[PDB]
Subunit: 97 residues, 4 copies
Amino acid sequence: MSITLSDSAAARVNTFLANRGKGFGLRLGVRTSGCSGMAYVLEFVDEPTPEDIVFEDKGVKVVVDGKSLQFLDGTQLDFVKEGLNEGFKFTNPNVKD
Amino acid sequence: MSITLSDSAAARVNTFLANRGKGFGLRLGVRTSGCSGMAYVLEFVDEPTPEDIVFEDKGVKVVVDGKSLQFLDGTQLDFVKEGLNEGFKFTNPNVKD
Amino acid sequence: MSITLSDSAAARVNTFLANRGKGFGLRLGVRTSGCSGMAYVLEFVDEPTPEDIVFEDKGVKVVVDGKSLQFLDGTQLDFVKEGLNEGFKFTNPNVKD
Amino acid sequence: MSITLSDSAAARVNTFLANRGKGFGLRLGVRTSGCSGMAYVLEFVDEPTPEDIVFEDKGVKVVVDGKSLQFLDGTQLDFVKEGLNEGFKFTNPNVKD
């Protein structure tokens, strides 16, 4: 944590968790986009691994691999509707552009 | 640091710094690629700002904004030649894909 | 996590948790010793706060305030017997002396 | 950096550096106080090692071992006079007591 969710993102995640009928909560992750690039990833979690770090915002369990925490700290997960596009959006004060 | 450069990257950076004729060294940075994405950035530096953190690998000064250090720690800057493509490549043990 | 417990520490903590009859697990914390000093602190936890980060080693829930994580990462909690003294001991590879 | 010096601390350090007649600046470090304890350390630096991270506040070069940066980030070095006592004092918002 110092990872936060906006109302709409928590709502969206809770919506997903409710329709599914099970699950511990939300996984934030990170992967290479290619060569000089990082991509954020979202997944459902049923079970935290022993490698995982677990925390809470707006009553949503967020699971983050311990090794990925350096990249994700300070992240605000938002859910936005822009034009014909609707989906999750990651923000950092520390980062820019 | 715990940011490292490979021989070829240091060489490449030193090559760039030599042909240019001036410069303090190398800036590692980070920017949003879009929505759920981070892009690594490389720039020349003539002057560290007071916000900057400075360190050394293979006698190359690396300058990193203090706020970007969470994302870049553990980074190995390499320089690779693959097919018709030649350029810088960022690696992290912590990250994957 | 990247916070670990030795066998004896986990045993000791589980022993404590068993005799007590309840509790979520273990809190690792940090406080000022005075002027130029930090002291590690151990406490029982019944409830993770929303500020807390939770993780696992040897089936012991470790709770760490999100703000204290910078100081505690890489910590090995051990439990040692030395002479007439027996108690918890904190180690870091990164740190020395 | 995100390590800062107060006016009095920078003054004090610069005073020390001036009377000495040489030196690159200031080393912030960390050592074990004993068992469950950390102590902050201050030293002069003439030469940053390749392991070191260098930054600036109030035109004072602060040198911090890369491995010690997790413990020192967010530190405010102050210099205070309290009673018959006068000396350096380390603060963190993140930490308490």
